Every structure is written in C-alpha cells, then in structure tokens.
Amino acid sequence: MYQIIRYEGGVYKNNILKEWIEDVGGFIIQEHVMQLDVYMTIAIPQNEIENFKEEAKKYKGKIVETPLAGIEIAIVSPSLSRHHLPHIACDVSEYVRKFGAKPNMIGLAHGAGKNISEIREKEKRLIQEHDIAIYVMGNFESCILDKTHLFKVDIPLVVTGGPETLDIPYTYVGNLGRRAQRLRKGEEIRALRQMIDEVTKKINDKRMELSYDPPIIPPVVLKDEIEKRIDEVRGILAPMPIVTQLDGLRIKMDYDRNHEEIENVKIGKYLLKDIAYVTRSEMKNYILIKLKSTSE
Amino acid sequence: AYTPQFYPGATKVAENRRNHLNPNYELEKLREIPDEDVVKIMGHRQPGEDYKTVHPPLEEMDFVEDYARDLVEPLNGAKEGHRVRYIQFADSMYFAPAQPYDRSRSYMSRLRGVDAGTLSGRQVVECRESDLEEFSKNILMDTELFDPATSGMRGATVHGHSLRLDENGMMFDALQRCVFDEKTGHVMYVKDQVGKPLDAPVDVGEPIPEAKLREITTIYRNDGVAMRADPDVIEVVKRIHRARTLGGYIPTNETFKGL
Amino acid sequence: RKEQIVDCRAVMGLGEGGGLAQRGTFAEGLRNDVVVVAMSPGRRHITKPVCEITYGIREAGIQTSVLVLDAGGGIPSDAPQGSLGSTFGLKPEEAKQVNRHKLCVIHFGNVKSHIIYKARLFLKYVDIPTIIVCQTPVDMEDFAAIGIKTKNVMPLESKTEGKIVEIITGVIRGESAPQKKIDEIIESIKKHLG
Amino acid sequence: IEIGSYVRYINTGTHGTVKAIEPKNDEEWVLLENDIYYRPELLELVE
Amino acid sequence: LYNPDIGVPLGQRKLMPYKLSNTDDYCEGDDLHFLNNAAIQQLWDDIRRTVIVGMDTAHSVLEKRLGVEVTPETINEYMHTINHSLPGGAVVQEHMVEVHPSLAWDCYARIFTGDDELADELDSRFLIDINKLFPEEQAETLKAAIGKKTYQVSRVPSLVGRVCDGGTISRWSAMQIGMSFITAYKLCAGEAATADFSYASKHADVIQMGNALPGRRARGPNEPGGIRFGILSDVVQTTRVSEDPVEQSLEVVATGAALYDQIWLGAYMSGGIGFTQYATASYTDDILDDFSYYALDYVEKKYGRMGTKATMDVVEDVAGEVTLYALEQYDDYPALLEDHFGGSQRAAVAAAASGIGVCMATGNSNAGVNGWYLSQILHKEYHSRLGFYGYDLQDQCGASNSLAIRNDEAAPLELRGPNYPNYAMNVGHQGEYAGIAQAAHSARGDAFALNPLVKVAFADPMLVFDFSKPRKEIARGALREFEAAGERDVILPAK
Amino acid sequence: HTVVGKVTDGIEIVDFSNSGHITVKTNPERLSVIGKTQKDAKILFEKHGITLKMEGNIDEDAIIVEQVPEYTMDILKSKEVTTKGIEPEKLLYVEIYDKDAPTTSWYFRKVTGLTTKRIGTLKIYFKHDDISMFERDWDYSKGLLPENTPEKSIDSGIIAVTNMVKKYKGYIGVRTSSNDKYGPTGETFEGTNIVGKVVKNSEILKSVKQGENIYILEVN
Numbered sequence A: 001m002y003q004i005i006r007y008e009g010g011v012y013k014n015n016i017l018k019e020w021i022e023d024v025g026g027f028i029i030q031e032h033v034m035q036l037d038v039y040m041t042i043a044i045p046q047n048e049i050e051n052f053k054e055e056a057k058k059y060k061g062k063i064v065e066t067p068l069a070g071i072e073i074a075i076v077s078p079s080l081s082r083h084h085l086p087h088i089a090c091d092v093s094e095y096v097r098k099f100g101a102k103p104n105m106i107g108l109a110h111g112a113g114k115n116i117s118e119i120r121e122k123e124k125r126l127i128q129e130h131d132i133a134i135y136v137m138g139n140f141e142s143c144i145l146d147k148t149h150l151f152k153v154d155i156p157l158v159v160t161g162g163p164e165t166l167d168i169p170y171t172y173v174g175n176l177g178r179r180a181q182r183l184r185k186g187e188e189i190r191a192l193r194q195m196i197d198e199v200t201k202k203i204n205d206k207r208m209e210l211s212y213d214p215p216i217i218p219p220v221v222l223k224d225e226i227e228k229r230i231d232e233v234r235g236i237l238a239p240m241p242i243v244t245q246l247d248g249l250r251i252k253m254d255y256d257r258n259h260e261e262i263e264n265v266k267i268g269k270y271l272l273k274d275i276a277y278v279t280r281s282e283m284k285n286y287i288l289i290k291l292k293s294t295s296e
Numbered sequence B: 001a002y003t004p005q006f007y008p009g010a011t012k013v014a015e016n017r018r019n020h021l022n023p024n025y026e027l028e029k030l031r032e033i034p035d036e037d038v039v040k041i042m043g044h045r046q047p048g049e050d051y052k053t054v055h056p057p058l059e060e061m062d063f064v065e066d067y068a069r070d071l072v073e074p075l076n077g078a079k080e081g082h083r084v085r086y087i088q089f090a091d092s093m094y095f096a097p098a099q100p101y102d103r104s105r106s107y108m109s110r111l112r113g114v115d116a117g118t119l120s121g122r123q124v125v126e127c128r129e130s131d132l133e134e135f136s137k138n139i140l141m142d143t144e145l146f147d148p149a150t151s152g153m154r155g156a157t158v159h160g161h162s163l164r165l166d167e168n169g170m171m172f173d174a175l176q177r178c179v180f181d182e183k184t185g186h187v188m189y190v191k192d193q194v195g196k197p198l199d200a201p202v203d204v205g206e207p208i209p210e211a212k213l214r215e216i217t218t219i220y221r222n223d224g225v226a227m228r229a230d231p232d233v234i235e236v237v238k239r240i241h242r243a244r245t246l247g248g249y250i251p252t253n254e255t256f257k258g259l
Numbered sequence C: 001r002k003e004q005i006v007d008c009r010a011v012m013g014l015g016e017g018g019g020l021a022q023r024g025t026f027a028e029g030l031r032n033d034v035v036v037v038a039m040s041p042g043r044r045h046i047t048k049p050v051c052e053i054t055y056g057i058r059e060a061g062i063q064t065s066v067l068v069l070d071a072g073g074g075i076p077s078d079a080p081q082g083s084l085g086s087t088f089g090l091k092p093e094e095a096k097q098v099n100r101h102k103l104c105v106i107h108f109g110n111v112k113s114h115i116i117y118k119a120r121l122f123l124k125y126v127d128i129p130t131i132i133v134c135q136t137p138v139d140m141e142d143f144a145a146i147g148i149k150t151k152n153v154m155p156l157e158s159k160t161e162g163k164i165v166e167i168i169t170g171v172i173r174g175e176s177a178p179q180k181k182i183d184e185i186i187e188s189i190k191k192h193l194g
Numbered sequence D: 001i002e003i004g005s006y007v008r009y010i011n012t013g014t015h016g017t018v019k020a021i022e023p024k025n026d027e028e029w030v031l032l033e034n035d036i037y038y039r040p041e042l043l044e045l046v047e
Numbered sequence E: 001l002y003n004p005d006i007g008v009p010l011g012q013r014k015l016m017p018y019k020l021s022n023t024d025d026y027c028e029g030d031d032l033h034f035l036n037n038a039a040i041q042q043l044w045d046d047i048r049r050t051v052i053v054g055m056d057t058a059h060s061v062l063e064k065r066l067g068v069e070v071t072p073e074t075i076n077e078y079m080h081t082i083n084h085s086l087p088g089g090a091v092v093q094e095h096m097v098e099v100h101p102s103l104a105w106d107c108y109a110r111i112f113t114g115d116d117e118l119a120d121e122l123d124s125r126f127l128i129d130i131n132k133l134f135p136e137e138q139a140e141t142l143k144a145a146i147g148k149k150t151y152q153v154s155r156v157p158s159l160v161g162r163v164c165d166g167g168t169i170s171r172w173s174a175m176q177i178g179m180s181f182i183t184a185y186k187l188c189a190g191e192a193a194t195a196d197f198s199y200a201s202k203h204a205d206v207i208q209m210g211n212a213l214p215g216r217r218a219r220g221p222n223e224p225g226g227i228r229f230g231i232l233s234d235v236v237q238t239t240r241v242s243e244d245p246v247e248q249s250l251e252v253v254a255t256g257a258a259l260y261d262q263i264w265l266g267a268y269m270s271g272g273i274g275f276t277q278y279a280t281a282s283y284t285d286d287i288l289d290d291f292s293y294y295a296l297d298y299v300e301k302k303y304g305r306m307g308t309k310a311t312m313d314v315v316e317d318v319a320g321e322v323t324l325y326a327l328e329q330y331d332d333y334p335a336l337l338e339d340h341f342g343g344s345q346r347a348a349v350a351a352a353a354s355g356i357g358v359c360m361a362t363g364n365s366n367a368g369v370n371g372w373y374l375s376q377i378l379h380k381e382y383h384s385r386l387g388f389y390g391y392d393l394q395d396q397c398g399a400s401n402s403l404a405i406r407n408d409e410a411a412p413l414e415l416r417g418p419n420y421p422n423y424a425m426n427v428g429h430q431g432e433y434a435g436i437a438q439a440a441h442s443a444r445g446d447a448f449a450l451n452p453l454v455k456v457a458f459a460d461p462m463l464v465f466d467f468s469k470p471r472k473e474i475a476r477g478a479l480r481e482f483e484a485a486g487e488r489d490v491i492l493p494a495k
Numbered sequence F: 001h002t003v004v005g006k007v008t009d010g011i012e013i014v015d016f017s018n019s020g021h022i023t024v025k026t027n028p029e030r031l032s033v034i035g036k037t038q039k040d041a042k043i044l045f046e047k048h049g050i051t052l053k054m055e056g057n058i059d060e061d062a063i064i065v066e067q068v069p070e071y072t073m074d075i076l077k078s079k080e081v082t083t084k085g086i087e088p089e090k091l092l093y094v095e096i097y098d099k100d101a102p103t104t105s106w107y108f109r110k111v112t113g114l115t116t117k118r119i120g121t122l123k124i125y126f127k128h129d130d131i132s133m134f135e136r137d138w139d140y141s142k143g144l145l146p147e148n149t150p151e152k153s154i155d156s157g158i159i160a161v162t163n164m165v166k167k168y169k170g171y172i173g174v175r176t177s178s179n180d181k182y183g184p185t186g187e188t189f190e191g192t193n194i195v196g197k198v199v200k201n202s203e204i205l206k207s208v209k210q211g212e213n214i215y216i217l218e219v220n
C-alpha cells in the first residue's frame, strides 16, 4: 500500500510539500537538510504516487526509487580495525544506505584469523535481530572455505570476498575483498551492484513470505502512531530514533524504563501488547517490536 | 529636444529596467528605515557624530583658475571635504527586484558623482559619505529596489546570488547579517554590512511577496519571463554586436550599409 | 577483545566517487567512550586523519563514535572583529551527542588564532575532557589566554566548562597519520580516560 | 617563586611578574601579571 | 531564540566529487589543482620539452660540402648515436662525465618522414610511423602536407625543463644534434660545416612549440604564453582516434583550459590558489558537452556541418540560439547553476558552446570568436551580470577585433594566442578559444589545424602523457595512478 | 487536521467528482442569525426548541448584531441564545472596493469578520477630532502591498488601511473631513490604500469613545 521512496530537493517551500504529504496521508520517515537541499524518505499510498511525482516536479525535486528503504541490514566485518573498517566495510554500508536501508556495522570480537575465528552467541542474536546480514570476508579461497562456521544465522545472507567464485553453501559475490582504497573502479562498482541485486532479491522474496500472511498493522504506520503518542521519541540522540524493519520496529529507548509505556499504546482498537512482541534488544538495551500476523 | 526612451522590449522585465533607468519615474517605496538605522547597517560612522574629512572645504583650499572645471556644481560632501565611502548589495538570481548591471546603469543615470562597479554576485557604489547616506536611505533601501529577502546590503563575504533560497525565501548568507523573525514576519539586520554585530538589530521590513517579486524583477528567467518572449531586446543586442563588428572591420558609411 | 557495533548514519555520502560521511551527522558507537569530531566530511578531514584515529582507538579496544559537524569550517562569530569566510558553530543536539561520551577527540588545522577560538566556542557547550589534534605546534597556554579551561595552564576567569586535556601536534589534514601519532593519541586517551 | 618575582613560561617564554598564589583543588597555581594562572612545575625563576 | 553561535554551513557542493566529462571517474576538486595533479604537470612538461628539427639542410651540407654520402644505413647509425647523446652520453672528447640514465628515461630522439621509400628501410625503433598511427585519408593528407622531407623530434628530459626554463630545450637539442652528427659521420670536431649544422639546427630548420616573448612579457621560448591556439589544437590527438567533431573540440578545450587557464594564468602570471574552478568548469561535468551537442544538433538540423558560408546572419542565429538554450538550461536546473556558481564559469561555457556551434556551421574560426563575443554580450543582457569585473575586457573589444585587419588587432584565431594583446591578462577565455579554433577544422574533417609536424610529433606512442584522451589522463593523475617523469629519486637519500 | 464531522450517505458524489460543485446538506442548521431581523430569529429558534432572550433593541425589525453563544454547537448543547439587537441609526453602512483593492479588501473582510457573518465589528483604537482609527490584526496584514493609493485629495468618509510602507501597517481608520496631504490614518498618500467608504450612516463616529465597537453592514 505504502511504497517508500526518497525525495531530493531544496529546503525552499519544502514545508508546503510536507503539508501536502500530510494531507494525502503519507509519512516522512527520514529528513536531513545539508545546506540548502533536503533529502526525505517518504512512505505514501500507491494511489498517490503519480500525484506526488507531479508535485515533486513542481518544486524541481527528484524522486529516487529506493528498493531497500524499509529494512535494516547488518554488515558484519571480522573487526573494526584498519584492515576492514575504514575501507570496503564503509563502502558496503554506504552503498546499502544509497538504496534506503539502515545499516549497522557488526565488528566481531574474534572474527579475524583462519582457525582462530569464532562468533559468540550474543553477536549471533544481534545479527539475527536484523532483516538481512552482509558478510565482508577476505580474499583467499582457503581462508573463506575454512570459515563457514561464521555464517550460521537463520537470516538471509550475502557473503562478499576476494575470489570471483566460491564454493560455500550460501549466496556469494566475488571481487569484493579486503582492500585499502575507496571502491571507485568499474569492476568494484559492478561487484557492489551485484551484491545490491542479491540482497534486493532476498528482500523481495521475504516480502512475498510476509505478504502471504500480512501483519495486522504496517510497520511504518505503527511507527507514526508511536511517534504521535509517545512524547519521548524526539529526545532520542541515536542516528535513527525508530528503525522501520521488514515486520517490526526498533525503538531506541531504554527497555527497562519504557517497555510498559510502549506496550500500553492503543492502536485502532487493540493494545500494542496484543498485536506485537515487545522485547528487550541486545542492541544497547533498546526495545524491539515484532509484529504478529493476522492469523493470531 | 530629445525625449529619451531607456530600454527596448515589451515584457514586464524590460519595463522594470526602463523604470529603474528613468530618473523621472518615482520608485514605489515599500518600507521606512530611519536614516540612523541605515547609517548603522552601513557601519562606517557612528550616527550623531560629524563626518570625517579627507581635505579642507573647497573654499579653504586654493585651486588654479579653470573655467571648464568651475562649470560643474560640486556635491555637498565634496564641498565639505567628506571622505568617500561605499555601499554594496548582493542580488539573488531568483527574481530579485534589482540586478547588478541594472543597478549600475540606474545609479549612473540617477545619481551625481557616483562610482558604480558591477560583478556577477556583487554591486558597489562609492560616493562622498553624506550624499551616499542620503541616496542610500531615499532610493536604495526604502524603495522597490531593495527586498530584504532576495537582496542584501553586504560587503566582505558575498555569496549566494546563484544558490537557491532558504526555507524563508531569503538569499543564502555565510555571515548571517539578516535573520527572519517568524514571530513578526520581519527581517532584522543583526550585523552591519561588513559583518560586525550590531548592538540593536534593525527592522528592515518584511520580505516582498513572490507575486510582487515576479512583477517587479529585472531578470529574465525561463520560469518567470524568458528572453525568447522578448524578441525586441535580442534584436537590439544583435544590432549592437553587428555595429561593433562592422566598425572594427572598416569604419565607413559603405561597410555600415550591411547593418 | 569484545564485539564492537556502530550505529551507522541514516543518510548516504557525498555522491558517487566522493566521501562516505555526510555533514551534520552522528554515528553512535553504542557504548559511549570516545567521540571523534570532524569539521567536515571532506577529504581534508574524513578517512585521511579522522577514520585513522577512529580505527586506532577501535584497535585499542575503545568504542568510538564519529560526529561530523554541520558547520565545522571557519572561525566563531565571537572571534575578534567577527568571523571571515565562514562561521564556526556547534548545535545543541551536537553538544548533547558529544556530552554523553567519556572523552572527545577533535581534529583542528594550521592557524593558531583559528584553533584557539574554535576550541573556546566548542568547550562553551562541551563539559567532557577533550584532546586537540592539530598540525601546527600550539602551546597548552594560548587557549588559557582567551579563557579556556586547560589542564596545565588554568585561566583566572574561565569562559568554558570543558577542559583541554591534551594537545597533539604534527597531524596534517588529508594525509595518512603515522602509527606514532596514533600511539600517542591512544596513550593520552588511556591515561586520561581510565 | 614569590610575589613580585620575574618568571618566564618555559614553553613560550612569556615574561611577567607573579601577582598571587591561589591554591585550588589541593594544587598550587601561580598568577602572573597577564591575569593567567600557571603551574609552578612549568615555571622557573629568572634574574 | 536567535543564537549567534550556531554558525552557517557552507560549501556543500564543493564537498561532492567532480566527475570528468566523457569519462566515468570521480575526483575531488583538490586533486584537479595543477600543483596536485601530476598529469597536468606532465602535459606541460611534454609540450615544453618537444623540439622538431628538419634534418634535410644538414644532409645537404654533408653531401655537397663535406662530400659525405647519406644513406638509410647512415641515418640509422645517426639515430642510434643521438638516442645515446641527447640524454647526456659522451661521444667525443675523452674523459667526460655523463648524466644518470635513470633521470633521463623519458628522453627520446624520434624520426618521421613523408617519404615512404625512405621510411620503409628505417629502424622502426626510432620511427614515428604516419601510416600506422593515422587512418588512411589522414595519413595521406599529412604526407601531402609534409612532403618528401625528413624530420627529427627531440624530447629532452623533463628534468632539464624543470631545473631550467623552457628556453633551454632548443639549445640542448641543437648541441646534441651537432655532436651526434660529427660523431656518426666521422667528421672533424669543429669546422665551417659544423657551424652550418649548428645554425640549421638552432633556427633555420627548428620548430618551437612557443615563440619567445621579449620586452614587457619578458619570457623565453617554449613557454605556455607563446603557444598559439592552432599549435595546441595540433598537440591534441583526438582527431586521429575519433570522428566526433564535438568530442575533438571538447578535448582541445580541456587541454587548453588545463594549460592556459590553470598553468599559464594561475601560476606564470598569478599565484597561490590559481584558477582551478575557472578551468574545470569546461571539462568536469557534461554541461559544456551537452551545450555543444545541442549546438551541433541545431546546426546540422538547419545548416549542416559545412552547409553555409560564414556570414553575419548565421553567426547571429547560431550564437543567439545556443546562448539562449544554455541560459535556459541554467535557469531550469538548479544543480547546473550551483555547479557553475561564478558568473565567469557560466559565461565562458555558454560562449564556448556558441562559438563551437558557429564553427561547426561555417568552418571559420574568426566567425567562431565572433559568435563567442555575441554570446557574451547576450548573456550580459539576459542575466544582468557577466563575471568578475575585469573579465569582459576582451569581450567588449572582441566584436570589433574579431574580424579586424589592423596590425595590432588582426590575427586568424589559429595564429592567436595568450600573447594576443586583448587575451594577455584574463582567465576563462583562452582554452575555449583553442577549442573554437579546433572546432573550425573538426567541422571540415581536417587532419590538422596549423602544423602537420606538430600533429605527427605528438602522435608518438612513447610520450609520457597520452594526448589522444587528455581528460582521461587528467582523471588518472587526479587519482594518483599517473606515472610522471622528471623525478630524481636515484640521486636523493632515503626518507 | 481538525475533524468537523462526517458524510453519512451519498458518498459517491464525493468519490467520483473531480472538480466543480457538490450539493451538501448539513444536518445541524447554522444557527447564526446576524443579518436577520428579530422576528426571524425568534421563529427560527423557537422552531428548533431553543429558549430565547433579548439583550439590545427589542423591536421585531431590529437587526441582530451579536448573539451569545455565537457558535451552533454551543447553542445546541446549551439550548439557549442571548440575541443582541442594535438601533437602526447605530449601524454603520459601508461599501467595500473588492475589485479596486483585492488584497486590502480581503484583509479588511478578514479583520472585521465579514468573511463569516453578515455584520462586522470595528473597534476604535485611537481618536482625535476628525480622525478615528480602528484596531488592526497582526495576523492578516502580511501581503499589504500598496494597492489603491490616493491620487488627489481624499474625500470625507473614506475607509483606508495603511500598507506595509509605513510603520503602523494594517491599522484601519476613517475621517469625517477632507485633506490633501494625509490619509484617514495620519500617513501620507503613498502609505495608505483606500479599501472602502461609509455610504449611509454617519455622525456616530464622532460620538463613540475609545475601545468601543461599531458594527458595519456591507451594501455593495
């Protein structure tokens, strides 16, 4: 119903456009003003897409179709050191961001090495809390092959590495190894696009799975209702105060202090505790909301 | 005698340019800024104190006899020996009421003893301080030549004539001399034209509505008034170019038959 | 050796072949220990001297956040005869995001008169000890000459609530910082943090 | 080091006369003629 | 609520990378500075260190005065000798010192000839083959222009022009040519015929890239102020690898901007920051490419590539149409306007497109500059602004000087240059003038613009800078992957 | 968005109409009788079963000027109305130049309340002899560009609003005499735009104190 896109335009007369979006029933998921241009991730009903395109072309704006602007991705790097973090890992994260997703760098405590690499249970659960996980591996076939125990999560997976083709029982994208320069060559860009296509395919499949038994309320409108009701969400200092997942939300407020308030939020005629699973998150003691399906 | 036209064209932009060039056309005033407030924004002298001089009054100094030099009546600032100061404006490309070359032409057509300089994102006029303040208040600031949103009295850092406007329709300023007071809807100058803060902000009125800006602007734009919609200006420009070319090739009456 | 999770920014970078960070953005490192403040996302600040300090701290075992200032270039409006070229400033949300960290590391440039006043305006709203990483040799007293709280040279009338806890010189903008500078910064952070 | 002496800052060489000693937070501080506190360990006597 | 300590964010666009026209590389604006870009420095070095010497008078002296017989074998031996002597090796005078070969690895002495029979039995190591490097029609045109003459191209080391100035190159080549001549043909080391060789190679048969500027300008030869626009058009080698006239003119525009506006004007006649954003405006984004392609489409739709003879009416029509289109594009797309924030950038781009269009319509370069000046004075009335004050000096006197015949004001645009009196000071004009001069000949499908020898000489595959695709090389230099000569690391201590 | 109600039946005319007019019936009739006579208000309010009382002029032909409460929802929830009438000669008759000064006339209608009701109220702000200035609304005086400025001497009984040129923008005023220099609000002609004139009832502007409200009726 609500297809999510990105509007890129100027700040002049942007308030009138926001008023129009409110009038037609859309939601402004994201807003950022750089100097004189504003980027807005907006979720509006499908029957108003052409109307919004006409409105955007009136303000000399630009509509960018974001195929991943409803999910949060766990980019898993073996460590946050100079080998992986300041290059490749950021390129993967920023390319994911370029298509609307909300990434989270996951630097494993013991992810480096060949036979000394291990993944903890807490890291496993933290990765599982996301929608899809992207692994940024090295550039040796033997090292990657002797490292399959790292990619043991019941989440859609895309593994990236140096060698062009791997023989692991997962999706693999080659020519994205451990590097030290910014990814700007044509081959590297093509490999990034291939990784984007793989994650897009997995996300669309999962979207069909969810569409078989739709949730009682969409995550985006649930986030809007929480923002309207809860008055502490504008005091959050995190990058994304409320993250829109595929079938839920992540509220970046303390669980011990605000879970009772979150649960006792009335949407429609239901109480939130009766339609969603509110639980504490392994992510800095935040609140994780998982929506129930109409079957229950 | 010779009754002067001032500019070719039939569009509203050409008419506004003619109005600015016309010295007998009374510019419509849209605000009232006191003389002391203009002097404060200008930032050269403290209001209430006397003008500094660069030379003794013209009566005190001795000059040789010069019949042709004595035919011209000097300015009062020249008579008293006041120093020469400047006032500078930046005009937005988005329908600002006055534009650099238009400003310079109107200044040299309407004011006496002025020094006008034109840049792409800047326009400055220099004159003796007393007369400069007089015509800055009377013509430059109180009339339609000035819009507190799309134009700004600013020296030092000028930038934003080609950038887009901000959320209030104001031209970009890297020093933020003028801010928009949303409570009253007025533009207030919190700094003088070079950037040093003012003790008391001065109210310069409220931004001109955009429809009026479309009606009074002197710039040609694809969205408001295109030069293609004014073929008469293009023809005159091409005529000037061809006359220049023919005169630079061979300046005779025969080569100008191909004009 | 413990897991380190970063809250990546919610907005993308500067175009295709440009930088990965964006101006006026914050990336929380969950457990708030150190925040690295970059004046801009440009090549003069980002990934050449700043992400290097970031990965040095993250290698030392200390979680790090990186904050790119919305307006980090220029001199503050309170500088003598005002500012020129551009105006430096700190937003209240930026100050709140900084103030939840144990320590701050901030990267400054070449001109001394710019650095002193920028640090004064920065510490007017930041109340945690900070480390100044600049190129020029600046003495840990010229900040006190204009009123800044300083560990070695206190002012009689302090105009800031933040303490300049260390000054490290020899880090050039846009150039890879050698391992010696990273080691010095890490040692200062470790000895002035816990 | 005492009031009226002549001291110079080792790091820069600024010359001034000691105005007062104002201990704070169980720590000695030296005030010079420029109304700036200093540390005794970073100052030394000159004649 | 007004907080004066919030500050004003500034320069968002300048933080974003600059694409390069007709390429797919993104680079920072700091990497396009001529001091920070080794590719631009190597471009200027390769142009500076090139001298073409006609080795026909010397052969005639050897045949008619010294009674020595010149055959292709003797020429091969001479080439072997000079390739050793020109970098600084010793041929006579026992007990000499020699320059380190590592510092002169870019030093070549090449030979090309319009005589196919002589070119057949010549060592292909030292031969610039016109047949192999140029398409059939272009090769025939170049051979017809050059004739049955033999020329030698000397590329003295870049280190020589970096330690010294540009006036060193001709003298260096002349001394080494004389030495190689006297040692390859077993002549007396010093006689009257030696003076004949020296005079021939010093001025009679020498071709300089740039003339000297004595007097007020005060500069030696082979400086960027002495390079005419046609010479720079012939330096660029896109004409022999591509058939798109707009692409050729735009590569010449990029090279001209990077040479004149950046190096010559922002360093030789100015200093400090220089003019990087004035020059990159013509070759970073496709703005100039889009405007030029529109101009070509309009001309081909109503006139044709050479369908009309240069008259005033066609100049007015094409220049006005292209200027109106370019300014409308600036109005419609705020991204374009914020990219070319300065008025000078915009004026230069629109006027360059208009001049290129007029040249593609008429095939005359002076009509091209006339169109450029009409575009400037039409831009002025359209936007009520042109550029920085001091920009439109030459643009005001331009219309009168474009078709002038007076001594100080007349010159074909190929024969004009930075020493033309109107063009001698201001940025944002010269590279586009060179592009207009090239477009005058790209319309006709010409093999060269002003000098066939320069075209053949810079078609050499052993040049450090690839002049076929200047923008690609500039992008490579901006990305720190261009290898430049003139470096002296074998004679320096380890750091 | 403030929801004011719902459309019960016949939604399809709203669903399918893309432009033009749609006939709408409001179930609660608007109980705002300000341009009517006292007997009309009596019969309409008694036909709705609302207790009624009179405040001002009692005559059956007396024009209602104010009703308490003035909102239909309040009237229905309280089931009582206090209707105030005015003397026939106390009602000021004005004519508004809508074609001559569109923005100024729109501002005058908004500030005096003629956009919603049939009788507007003007409050006296400052008074001296011939000049009586009315209060302004510093919420509708935004686009007050000079619209209808005088060219000759202003005649008596002319309503004017000072435009954005002057410091006291938006203040309305009228004077009972004529002068060739100053407008009805004490500003020069370039700072006043004429919006309308008083047509029928006069000699009440000279007997109204500061702060008192006079009521106007548009006669076109």
Ligand code: F43
Residues within 6 Å of the ligand: B119, B120, B121, B122, B155, B156, B157, B158, B159, B160, B161, B162, E270, E271, E272, E273, E274, E275, E276, E277, E278, E279, E341, E342, E343, E344, E345, E387, E388, E389
């Ligand atoms: C900042 C100044 C001060 C001055 O004396 N010249 C400046 C700055 C100077 C310095 C910048 C370095 C520095 O430290 O100042 C240099 C490099 C001078 C030079 N050697 O060529 C320069 N400008 Ni300027 N300058 C430029 C430009 C411009 C445009 C900017 C337009 C806008 O509204 O933003 C305008 C000229 C105009 O009004 O047409 C301009 C103005 C100005 N320019 C005025 C404006 C403020 C003043 O009133 O004092 N530059 C440009 O248009 C782009 C090219 C750019 C040149 C450097 C480059 O090519 O990379 C630079 C060229």
Ligand SMILES: C[C@@H](OP(=O)(O)O)[C@H](NC(=O)/C=C/CCCCSSCCS(=O)(=O)O)C(=O)O
Residues within 6 Å of the ligand: B119, E265, E269, E270, E388, E389, E390, E424, E425, E426, E427
């Ligand atoms: C050598 C010098 O000659 P001249 O200064 O004696 O004319 C000559 N320079 C000039 O003509 C002028 C130099 C100024 C640089 C161009 C200005 S670009 S930015 C300034 C905009 S403005 O505010 O000055 O109008 C040159 O060839 O560079």
